[PDB]
Design an enzyme around this catalytic site. Sequence first.
Site, PDB file in Angstrom:
ATOM      1  CG  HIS A 219      -0.260   0.184   2.522  1.00 58.92           C
ATOM      2  ND1 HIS A 219      -0.020  -0.864   3.383  1.00 58.92           N
ATOM      3  CD2 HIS A 219       0.229   1.290   3.131  1.00 58.92           C
ATOM      4  CE1 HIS A 219       0.591  -0.413   4.465  1.00 58.92           C
ATOM      5  NE2 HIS A 219       0.756   0.891   4.335  1.00 58.92           N
TER       6      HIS A 219
ATOM      7  CG  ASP B 135       0.616  -4.231   2.853  1.00 56.63           C
ATOM      8  OD1 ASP B 135       0.969  -3.988   1.681  1.00 56.63           O
ATOM      9  OD2 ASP B 135       0.541  -3.352   3.736  1.00 56.63           O
TER      10      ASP B 135
ATOM     11  CB  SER C 261       2.633   1.515   7.809  1.00 57.04           C
ATOM     12  OG  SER C 261       1.976   0.549   7.006  1.00 57.04           O
TER      13      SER C 261
END
EC number: 3.4.21.5
Lengths: 48, 113, 311
Positions: C95, C151, C257
Amino acid sequence: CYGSYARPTNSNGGQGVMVEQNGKLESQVEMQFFSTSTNATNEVNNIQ
Amino acid sequence: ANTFLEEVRKGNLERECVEETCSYEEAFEALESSTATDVFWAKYTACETARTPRDKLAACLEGNCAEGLGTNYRGHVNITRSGIECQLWRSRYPHKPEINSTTHPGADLQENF
Amino acid sequence: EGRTATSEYQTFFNPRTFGSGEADCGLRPLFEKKSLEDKTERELLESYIDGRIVEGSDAEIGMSPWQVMLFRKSPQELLCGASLISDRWVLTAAHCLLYPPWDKNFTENDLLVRIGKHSRTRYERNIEKISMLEKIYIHPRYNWRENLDRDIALMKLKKPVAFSDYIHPVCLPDRETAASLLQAGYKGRVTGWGNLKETWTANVGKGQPSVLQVVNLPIVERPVCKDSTRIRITDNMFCAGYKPDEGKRGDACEGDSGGPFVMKSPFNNRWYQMGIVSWGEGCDRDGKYGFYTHVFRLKKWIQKVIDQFGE
Ligand SMILES: [Ca+2]
Ligand SMILES: [Ca+2]
Ligand SMILES: [Ca+2]
Ligand SMILES: [Ca+2]
Ligand SMILES: [Ca+2]
Ligand SMILES: [Ca+2]
Ligand SMILES: [Ca+2]
């Protein structure tokens, strides 16, 4: 205000104490400014 | 505004800025709580179409109904028209809103309302 | 504890394209080569004092070699975190690279990485290094449309960076190793600089830490993990972290992240990264823990990448 007198000092009937500052030559009169509160609160507009 | 000798009597937020076209000054004077002042202003603005009659402005003060395009709505409904969950206006998940809490702080942006 | 029973590291990847020094994953010359234990290791056992949530603590010097900071090439902006898996391959959240709804569509030539950084806002020339991305692989099973499943994003550096104390790859656990470590009850470690909180939350009041930050988070029950979210959770993503009791929100939104989630293995004195620190409900919603994306099963898949570059 009822019964309050104060003798004139200058020739033109303008009351004001003549302070002794380098002599009695000068009169001490200040200026103060005011603008609308509410109307000129939140905003600025140079608060004229 | 009218009844000139009103400024010597005590006043009623509802007998000046409700039952009458008022100055934000008398509004400001009567409110001082500038947060709710902005709220009342927001009201007035949105209620620009709810200026008359009086009970219409009272309802626009209640705020449960959206006026026109919905600038004034202050209820608790936080669901889309089709049941999709509403994303947090301030948060960037899943989209970073160009139009969000920073751009529109005066709408009282709740959790996802 | 491991005494006279040493579990040797089994090389599952060929050094030719996966990179040399694979046998030395997660071995800090300052700590591992001298058997020096960090001051934060005494909390590894889940039998600790009544499981009270521990606040954020500043990490030591040189104790985060596998952390990578994914930065915007132009203009200047911190983007995400990433995990160092080998001297010539890097692992980062997908992402952070591709998100068409987020107006985010990055090519291989638009982001860089920084390894071995101590302070984000400073530049310590000698000990830290920078790299510019060349090739990016995206796993076809990365599903961002339903729950951000898998992810996963792989990156390759054009100019390799040699081994150092502050830059060293982390070991890759397999299925059996992950099961053994998870059934042993050992806490996980998440390293970052608070960029996850900036990216996925608007919570202003706790400034983004420019110092290397570390958080210890244990695992919770999987069915409870399913019951902890209104959105479906795949097996490739799991819950980790203490349960934030009512009255406070947990620290699951600390760090960056895409960063690592590492556990010091007691069977070989090595650090194994269970996966990627991916987006979870711990940021957006109070009363939630950290959701992490599993990459331990991907060993067979890993070679499938470098089999393309075997020329
Ligand atoms: Ca006034
Ligand atoms: Ca009036
Ligand atoms: Ca009036
Ligand atoms: Ca009247
Ligand atoms: Ca008045
Ligand atoms: Ca009045
Ligand atoms: Ca009335």
